[PDB]
Amino acid sequence: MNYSYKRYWEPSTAEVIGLSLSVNTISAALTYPIEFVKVRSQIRTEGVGIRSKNLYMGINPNKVFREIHATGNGLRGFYQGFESHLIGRLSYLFIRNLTYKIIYDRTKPVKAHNDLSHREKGVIAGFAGGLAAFLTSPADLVNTRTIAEGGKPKEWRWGYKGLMDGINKIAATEGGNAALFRGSYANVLRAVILNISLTGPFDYLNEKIWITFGDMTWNKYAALLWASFWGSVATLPFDNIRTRLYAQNADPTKNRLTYSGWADAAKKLIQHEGISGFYVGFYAFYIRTFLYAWTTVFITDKITSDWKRKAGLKEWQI
Amino acid sequence: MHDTFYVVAHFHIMLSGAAMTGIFSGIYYYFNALFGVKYSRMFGYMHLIYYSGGQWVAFVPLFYLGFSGMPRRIHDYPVVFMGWHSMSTTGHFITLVGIIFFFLMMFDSHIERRASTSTTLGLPRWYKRISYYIFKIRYLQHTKSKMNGIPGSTVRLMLINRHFVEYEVYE
Amino acid sequence: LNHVQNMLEENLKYDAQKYNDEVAVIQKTSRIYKPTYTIEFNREGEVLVYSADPIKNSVVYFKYPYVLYEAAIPLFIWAWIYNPLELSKNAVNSLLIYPNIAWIPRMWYWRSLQYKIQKMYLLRGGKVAKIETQSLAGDRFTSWVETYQFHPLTQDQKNFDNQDNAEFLEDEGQLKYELGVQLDNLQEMGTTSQDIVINFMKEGTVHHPELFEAIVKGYNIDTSDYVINTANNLRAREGNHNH
Amino acid sequence: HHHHEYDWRDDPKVNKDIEEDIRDRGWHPETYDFPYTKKHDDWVFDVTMPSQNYQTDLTVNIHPENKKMHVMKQVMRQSYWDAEHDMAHEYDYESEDLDFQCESFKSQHFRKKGPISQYLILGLLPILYFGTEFFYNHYPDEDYWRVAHPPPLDYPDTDDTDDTETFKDYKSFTGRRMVDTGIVDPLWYDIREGKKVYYDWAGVNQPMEDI
Amino acid sequence: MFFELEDIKRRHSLYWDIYNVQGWVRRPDSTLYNNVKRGVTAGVVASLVQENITALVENCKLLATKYEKPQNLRQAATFMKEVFKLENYRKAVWNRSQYALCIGTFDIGARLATFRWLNNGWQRVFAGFEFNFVRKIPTTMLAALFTAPFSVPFELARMAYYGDKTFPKELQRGYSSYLSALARIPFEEGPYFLFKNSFPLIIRNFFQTFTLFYTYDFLKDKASFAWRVGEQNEYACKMIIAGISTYLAAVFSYPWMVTREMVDFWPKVPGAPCTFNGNYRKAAVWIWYHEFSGNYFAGFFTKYFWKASPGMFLTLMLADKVGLFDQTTVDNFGGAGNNSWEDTFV
Amino acid sequence: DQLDFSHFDKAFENKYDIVAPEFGDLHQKRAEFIAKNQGTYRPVPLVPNNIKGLIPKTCRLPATRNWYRRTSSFERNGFFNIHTPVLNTKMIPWLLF
Ligand code: HEA
Ligand SMILES: CCCCCCCCCCCCCCCCCC(=O)OC[C@H](COP(=O)([O-])OCC[N+](C)(C)C)OC(=O)CCCCCCCCCCCCCCCCC
Ligand SMILES: CCCCCCCCCCCCCCCCCC(=O)OC[C@H](COP(=O)([O-])OCC[N+](C)(C)C)OC(=O)CCCCCCCCCCCCCCCCC
Structure with missing residues (x-):
């Protein structure tokens, strides 16, 4: 099967x-309220x-969507964090793609197939995602707290009006720029796992469906x-x-649960919520992941x- | 007609149709005794419709092929049998859809999780008119209990008659 | 779907809720009729107020609207047999569609013959009337109906006659014309049907006309002044000329 | 015996995150006792039949069509297993528990329904199994379920696929006359360059490339 | 390469089989533009006729509420003339024609286009029947699911457009026409105003699409022996098949509108929680588990059948006429259909 | 304090502040008007009062005026009878064919 690649x-x-930035911006704009609902669901439990x-x-x-719409802001009230989420997502993608391209071009095989x-x-994608998530941890922290301050009491809300505003407020209130990387390790782990849990299964099922059904068109979408x-x-x-580490306020009094790290957060989740507590918002997260991946893959494939x-590859090489 | 699809259709209408239909009837008759929950009327009706008709559509063309001289146990045959063989395969796939509906009805019944109430209400036989009276009284009470939360005849007729509310010009 | 605000829908909801709350099962009534004579009920606490033999006096076979169809059937049969129009196979097959539906009007007429009232009794209490009819195959049906369900119809049956002040009875008490009465809900054979039209033929005999009229007009009859007759002159499934 | 303390997280009235099954409105299987000994259906009146006496009340008429709405009575929810308790009730002590049946009827083994996702497999058993016998096992062979593609021009050899020759057989004199007879359908492809291109009316996919 | 997931494209060597004309072979005429054009044409025509019929029936109902129904044929003709002369009837005709254009261009046309795009390549059998019709079940389910929520914004726009004419002018939005209402609602009340609690509409659309398309295709293929073996008209057969499919679709779609009626029209019990909590979805679930099916089939023809059944029937007939149900049928023993011609005549 | 689940704590409250009406000020005003004027403001669709050739409807019409005998019926307790004597009479022809 290692002979079958097409590069x-x-x-x-x-x-x-350019392609990654544009298509990922389109995908994030399309599928941001789903992540808003997912973050909202993970906080109410x-x-x-x-x-x-x-x-x-x-x-x-x-x-959750009906309640957030009944808040009164309508559909426009789902993009408060999107003001800051888009910048963080684009920075993560830029850093990850730069590192991935460099490491790949320094290690890719000679033969095009x-x-x-x-x-x-x-390994390459995990390193790239970890680095980019560590570098974009302040942006992801600002984005999550903007979503988090809707299902929390008025006293517990940070009140971030944007991305630079949130960065300045965190750097001033919580001590300094070192406080910008709260949950940075959690973001690094999330990116590392996300960067290794998609391509593998996708290629697995795509190739197995092709073996079973030949060169049909539904194979890649089912995969x-x-x-x-x-x-x-x-x-x-x-x-x-x-999300739990991002939404944790600095003041221990303004926290439903107080975590000293990723391990403490996991321990308290197991203690109070149980094993099933890790998969709250699964439908929203899965729908968001599928729609984001579909939009990105479809537009990237077309382009x-x-x-x-235009370059002149034969139709079997495309 | 020996060693012919006439014989095949004979013993398949006897076995695939009749015997399996009786087995399914016994399964439905003892569904509470088998699973402890009430069965699903909708998917059960779907399974009944697709499985029973599928047998006819799959094994009447086999009768027609047996009358045409189609020997058994041949994977290739004269091309004057392809139409009825296709019809038989269609009937078989209808039967497969019925089996899918039966498994779906088991799944939906175990989703439902409702205790089953015998239609006899404890009086399987009306040997006496007093037994008939007891069953009638209990049946009327049970039907009244079921028909709670459902508006009366007058209210339902009012809603049905005044359902349409899309008019252009008013007074 | 409810977020869309429609004032007609809101009016319908209010009407349904108000009918549910205000209008109750127990409804007060002031239409009470007190007869001027002692009522002699039978063994079963009932008084016979109307008797007839409708099927005996009904044209069953040679009724005009249906003999036309049943005589037109042979025309279609002959048209299919010889194909005088040089039609196609599907066209002649369509020509043979008719003989399968021409007897349906006769079937419906024969069914309507079973709603002509053969006997009507008033039960004690003056709130329930028993009605005995029979399907032409000789299938006897007995149905009990509350007296307030009755609404007399006009002679031409085209409009609701006034529930009171209507004169469908002669001076001596017999029916002036064949009287049609609509029942809002008739429980026939165990199933309730809405707006059922029954008929009392003029050829029948109306015993106790007053009570009969009070049954038709919807009044609750006062049966306080009553006596009971000890006469078991009827057997179960007793034979009658109405066959 | 006994039971644990109170937790508002487990209370549907207090914890609004607990979605209510409207089909279990009046049924609480966690309170069920085995064997079931609680009466939940008795005489009901004043729905359509008044509980008072108006049989000979000339001033009152009964109109059941005006049945006032009441709370809907859901069908009885089946019992749900209390796993630990069940695993403590049917538990056996080896070589220290006598082999006997207790006098109390509560020792009866009652069937309480459990999880539902397992029956999801039972819902998809006719599908998956068939796939397992046709897709996973590739029965009868690999190429049956794949989308059909004709072989290319003269592949794998001119003996199995004499397409070029067939082309000549349709362009020669005799072949033309054969088409005029109407017993031979027209040519279904064209040889363009070193490729074979099927016509649209042929009804087949195009041959795959020799990658 | 671009994001977390890489859509790896792998080259594969050649494969082929003995036969070529009974699997998925995309039709040449099944292009995006052609499918959209034909589906939109059939949908708009069917929707126009359906909405005209609906307006006529409802105006006849209104005139019946105001005047006695006819007693003979001449009175029926006079009643129809008076219904036609109604200003309310003519305004309803115009607005429902606009709604018909909107719903046949974006809902019925979209259903037909998606169904054709998904079911064009399933070829039949030369001299038999398409025995493997199960392959079209997941495909038709996807086609019905994809186009299920397309009619929701237009249905809710119609409801809101007719929902403001019944208010005092101090509380009215205007809405000179249904097109104006459709253009104005998403910017005034918000886009979600057209997609709130629309589960009954979505499930009704899904059931209509799936039942209608699957049943019509299945009966058109399997019952073809009636006009291939038996020498029938095949057009009476097509009409009977379309009617059966339409009746089945209406039967399988009405209970969800019944759920809507139960949730927001059934009188409440004071001092008690709502039976279905005002969601309609549990209502469907309740109807899915209700013992007395007839208890949710009352008003089947009065409320829903005569408002969707003519539309579905005409959609089927016009899709068949324009060739959205035509499947490729090629002989498997001659020429293109076979790769082993030696074993076809010996 | 919190984490003692014996009694509910406002720290675990999950409700979103109602900043504005969900569907607009006009929608809120019409909701209030419905809450106040439901059952009192009853619009009537426009039909001409006098129409030549039509007999005005002043009372309910008898069952003798129907052009079609309906099959299903209603049991007064709210039940829907698909199976009626009319259904039996209508099924007599079809089953015969
Ligand atoms: C009872 C036995 C039985 C059953 C049920 C069937 C069912 C079917 N049979 Fe067969 N058949 C035989 C017994 C049976 N058969 C025998 C003995 C032979 C001869 C062998 C020989 O020729 O040498 C034969 C031969 C035979 C041939 C001969 C092939 C050839 O000679 O050319 C064909 C081809 O048409 C055929 C077709 C079918 C079809 C299409 C079904 C369909 O009905 C299949 C439908 C599927 C089911 C009926 C299964 C039900 C599904 C469930 C999962 C039930 C389990 C659930 C519970 C009820 C709890 N059968
Ligand atoms: C290890 C754990 C278990 C792993 C199991 C893996 C498989 C799981 C089960 C299958 C999941 C669904 C996959 C559907 C993909 C369909 C794609 C497609 O176009 O397929 C074209 C195929 C073939 O279509 P065809 O009829 O045009 O092709 C016939 C072959 N030629 C080309 C030569 C003419 O159709 C299907 O696969 C239909 C699937 C319908 C849904 C049922 C899924 C299982 C199918 C089993 C084989 C067929 C049985 C039919 C009756 C079944 C009754 C129960
Ligand atoms: C599947 C859809 C099929 C559609 C078929 C029919 C298509 C043709 C008709 C379309 C009508 C609706 C679109 C109108 C567009 C023009 C109006 C407009 O945009 O106004 C500006 C609107 C105005 O929004 P608004 O809410 O502020 O409205 C103003 C009115 N108030 C405030 C009173 C409510 O702005 C936005 O919509 C901003 C956000 C951009 C769009 C976001 C789309 C999100 C889609 C859902 C994602 C998933 C959510 C979670 C799902 C559940 C969990 C998984």
């Missing part, structure tokens, strides 16, 4: 930067967990659905703990196929 045309650094039984386990994304194994690519499911399963506990056709 005749590889985009330049400028091409990958910060110390309660799942208390319903059987088919009612979890928090209803439609119920030979590509690095999934394990090597996972994308499968990859989104498994990536959500692998990443959601880390994302949940990252890159057009570029390959």
Whole structure:
């Protein structure tokens, strides 16, 4: 199968930067309210967990969406953190893609049909995602607290009007720039797990479906659905703990639970919520992951196929 | 007709149709005794409709092929049998859809989790008119209990008659 | 879907709620009729107020609207057999559709013959009337209906006659014309049907006309002044000329 | 015996995150006793039949069509297993518990329904199994379930696929006459360059490339 | 390369099989533009006729509420003339024609286009029947799910447009026409105003689409022996098949509108919580588990059947006419359909 | 204090502040008007009062005026009868064919 890779045309650094930034901006704009609901769901069960039984386990994304819309802000009230989430997402993607492209070009195989194994690519992507998540941890922290201050009492709300405003408020109130990286390790772990739990399963199911069904058109989308499911399963506990560490106020009095780190957050989640507490908001997170991946892959495939056709690759090479 | 799809259709209408339909009837008759919960009427009806008709659609063309001289145990045959063979395969896939509906009805019944109430209400036989009276009284009470939360005939007729509320010009 | 505000929908909701709350099952009534004579009930606490033999006096076979269809059937049969119009196979098959539906009006007429009232009794208490009819196959049906369900119809049956002040009875008490009466809810054979039209033929005999009229007009009859007759002159499934 | 303390997180009235099953409005299986000994259905009147006496009340008429709405009575919810308690009730002590049946009827083993997701497999058993017998096992062979593609021009050899020759067989004199007979359908492909391109009306996919 | 997931494209060597004409082979005429055009045409025509019929029926109902129903054919003709002369009737015709354009361009046309895009390549059998019709079940389910919420904004826009004409002019939005209301609502009340608690509409659309398309295709293929073996008209057969599919779709779609009626029209019990908590979804679940099916089929023809059944029937007929149900049928023994021609005549 | 789940604590309250009406000030005003004027303000769709050739409807019409005998019926307790004697009479022809 290592003979079957198709890397005749590889985009330049400028091409990958521009395409990634544009398409990921489109995807984040399309699928941000889903992440808003997911963060909202993970906070209303910060110390309660799942208390319903059987088919009612979890928090209803439609119920959360209806409540947030009944707040009064309408659909426009789902982008408060998107003001700051977009910058953090784009910076994470820029750093990750730069590191990934450099490490890949310094290690990629000579033959166009030979590509690095999934394990090597996972190592590269995990390093890139960890570095980018550590560098974008302040932006992700500002974004989460903006969403978090809707389901919390008036005394517990930080009141961030943007990204630079949040950065300045954190650097002033909480001690300094060192306080900007609260939950940085949690974000690093979330990015590392997310960067290794998608390509593997996606290629797995895509190739197995092709073996079973040949060169149909639904193969890649079914594999994308499968990859989104498994990536959500692998990443959601880390994302949940990252949200808990981000929403933890500096004042211990203004916290439903007080965490001294990732380990403390996990311990308290297991103690009060249980094992099932890590997968609250699973439907919202999985739908967001699938829609984001579908939009990005579809638009990138269209643009890159057009570029390959312009460059002159044969139709079997595209 | 020996060693022919006429014989195949004979013993499949006897076994695949009749015997399996009786087995399904016994499963439904003892559904509470087997699983402890009431079964799902909707998916059960779907399974009944698709499984029973599928047998006809799958094994009447086999009768037609048996009358046409189609020997058994051949994977290739004269091309004057392809139409009824296709119809038989269609009937088989209808039967498969019925089986899918049966598994779906088991799944939905175990979703439902409702205690089953016998239709006899404890009086399987009306050997006496007093037994008939007791059953009638209990049946009327049970039906009244079921029909709670459902508006009366007048209210339902009012809602149905005045359902349409989309008019252009008023007074 | 409820977030869309419609004032007609709100009026419908208010009407349903007000009917649910204000209007109750127990409804007060002031339409009470006191007969001027002692009522002689039978063994079963009932008084026979109307008797007839409708099927005996009903045209069953040679009724005009249906003999036309049943005589037109052979025309279609012959048209299919010889194909005089040089039609196609599907066209002649369509020609044969008719003989399968021409007897349906006769079936409906025969069913309507079973709603002509053969006997009507008033029970003690003057609130329930028993009605005995029979399907033409000889299937006897007995139904009890509250007296307030009755609404007399006009002679032409085209409009609701006034519930009171209506004169469908002659001076001596017999029916002036074949009287149609609509029942809002008739529980026939164990199933309730809405707006059922029953008929009392003029050829029948109306015993105790007063009570009969009070049954038709919807009044509750006062049966305080009553006596009981000890006469078991009827057997179960007794034979009658109405067959 | 006994039970644990009170936790408002487990209380649907206090914890609004607990979604309510409206089909379990009046049924609380966690309070069920085995064997069931609680009466939950008795005589009900004043719904359509008044509980008072108006049989001979000439001033009162009964109109059941005006049935006032009441709280809907849901079908009885089946009991849900109390795992630990059940695992403590049917538990066996080896070589220290006598092999006997107790006198109390509460020793009866009652069937209480459990989780539902397991039956999800039972919901998809006719599908998955069939896939397992056709897709996972690739029965009968690999190429049956794949989307059909014709072989390319003269592949794998001109013996199995004499497409070029067939082209000539349709362009020669005799072949043309055969088409005029109407017993041979027209040519279904064209040889363009070293490739074979099927016509749109042929009804087949295009041959795959020799990658 | 671009984000967390890499859509790895792998080259594969050639494969082929004996037969070519009974799997998925995309039709040439099944392009995006062609499918959209044909589906939109059929949908707009069917919707226009359906909405005209609905307006006529409802205006006849109104005139019946105001005047006695006819007693004979001449009175019926006079009643129809008076209904036609109604200003309310003509305004309803115009507004429901605009709504018909909107719903046949973006809902019925979208359903037809998605169904064609998903079910065009399923080829039939040459001289038999498409035995593997199960392959079209997940495909038709996806087609129905994708186009299920397309009619929701237009349905809610119609409800809001007719929902303000019944208020005093001090509380009215204006809405000179349904198109104006559709253009104004998402900017005044918000886009979610057109997508709130629309589960009954979504599930009704899903059931209509799936039942109608699947049943019509299945009966058009399987019952073809009626006009291939039996020498019937095939057009009476097509009409009967379309009617059966439409009746099944209406039967399987009405209970969700019944759920809406139960939730927001059934009188409440004072001092008690709502039976379904005002969600409609549990209501469907309740109807899914209700013992007395007829208890949620009352008003089937009065409320819903005569407002969607003609539309579905005409959609089926026009889609068949324009060729959205035509499937490729090629002989498997001759030429393109086979890769082993030796074993076809010996 | 908190983390003692014997009694509910406002620290675990999960409710979003109602900043503005969900669907606008006009929607709120119409909701209030409904809350106050439900059942009193009853619009009537426009129909001409006098129309030539039509007999005005002043009372309910008898069942003898129907152009179609309906099949289903209603039991007064709110039940819906699909199976009626009319249904039996209507099923007599079809089953015969
Ligand atoms: C009882 C036995 C039985 C059953 C049920 C069937 C069911 C079916 N049979 Fe067969 N058949 C035989 C017994 C049976 N058969 C025998 C003995 C032979 C001869 C062998 C020989 O020729 O040498 C034969 C041969 C035979 C042939 C011969 C092939 C050939 O000779 O050319 C064909 C092909 O058409 C055929 C078709 C079918 C089909 C399409 C079904 C369909 O009905 C299949 C439908 C599926 C089911 C009926 C399974 C039900 C599903 C469940 C999961 C039930 C389990 C659930 C519970 C009830 C708890 N069968
Ligand atoms: C290890 C754990 C278990 C792993 C299990 C993995 C498999 C799981 C089960 C399958 C999941 C669903 C996959 C559907 C993909 C369909 C894609 C497609 O276009 O397929 C075209 C195929 C073939 O279509 P066709 O009929 O055009 O092709 C026939 C072959 N040629 C090309 C030569 C003419 O159709 C299907 O696969 C239909 C699937 C319908 C849904 C049922 C899924 C299981 C199917 C099993 C085989 C078929 C049985 C049919 C009756 C079943 C009754 C129960
Ligand atoms: C699947 C959709 C099928 C649609 C088929 C029909 C298409 C044609 C008709 C479309 C009508 C609706 C769009 C109107 C667009 C023009 C109006 C407009 O945009 O106004 C500015 C609107 C105005 O919003 P607003 O809410 O401020 O409205 C103002 C009115 N108040 C404040 C009183 C409510 O601005 C926005 O919408 C800003 C956000 C951009 C769009 C975000 C889309 C999110 C989509 C859902 C994502 C997932 C959410 C979670 C789901 C559950 C959990 C998983």
